[PDB]
Design a protein around this nucleic acid. Sequence first.
RNA 1: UGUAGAUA
Length: 343
Amino acid sequence: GRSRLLEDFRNNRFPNLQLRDLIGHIVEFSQDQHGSRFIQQKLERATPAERQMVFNEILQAAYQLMTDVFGNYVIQKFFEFGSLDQKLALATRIRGHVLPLALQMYGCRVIQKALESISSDQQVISEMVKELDGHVLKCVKDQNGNHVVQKCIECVQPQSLQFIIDAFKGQVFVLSTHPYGCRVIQRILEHCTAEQTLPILEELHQHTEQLVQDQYGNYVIQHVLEHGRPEDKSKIVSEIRGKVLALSQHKFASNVVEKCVTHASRAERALLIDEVCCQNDGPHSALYTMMKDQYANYVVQKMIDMAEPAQRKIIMHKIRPHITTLRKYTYGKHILAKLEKYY
RNA sequence: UGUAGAUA
């Protein structure tokens, strides 16, 4: 029940209350929205002895506060301003409960804060991460857990993350189309060794055609194009070749086509552009179609920018007579600019 | 002129 002290504070009877005055009341106040903000505020100016006073009390109820809508911020504040002995002690209260905390709306914030606050080489940390072993996919798919998984990947030594990689075996296609899975996969590509990512990249190439057209998978494919090895980039480009026109008019895949134009080799880029500028499959010209498309106009712009003089000139000549046309379409109103300030 | 996740 709400003690007099808290009632009084909430009624503004203590307009300049000091942290020291909360001895015995820290845990109660931490679970109150206003008491919690008060403690957060005072911790930023508190002396070390004053922080320790607050620490002693919060430590005793650490798990409870970690899963509290208002107390979890007080816990986080010590990961922010506490000394390492204090952080390690709090981490110890996370240990043994990593899974339920990871899936919990407030608990998951505390875990991420610990991961950012405590040196990865500290046993505690290692122990915490290992508790996710056997639950990786459940966390990846959880609205709270997925951020914990990402933060582990961002913060911990990649060798220790082999179980996460193994967990993804045969699941890379499905999870790259997942709102959180795609983010986790991108973190993996960023942080794990080329050794670890090899099987991940393999499964990505297996399903490139599908992933480039997916609302989330298109981002994973773009990541590889922007950050991956040349040989992986060339694999993605080869999947795009022969499909430029179609993919360029696609809300998601248009973006991948752009990154292909930017990040391919001079020679690969030329072949892609050639598919737009210099081929004749049927009556309607590809360039003409792409020019005034809501999405493909962006691809045409990237091609004009990245093209060697010869191809650039052909594109310009082919657009030239269609000025009046590009006029009516919202989407040609950047292509026309480049046309004018090229002629 | 065009797409990405859980707290007071």
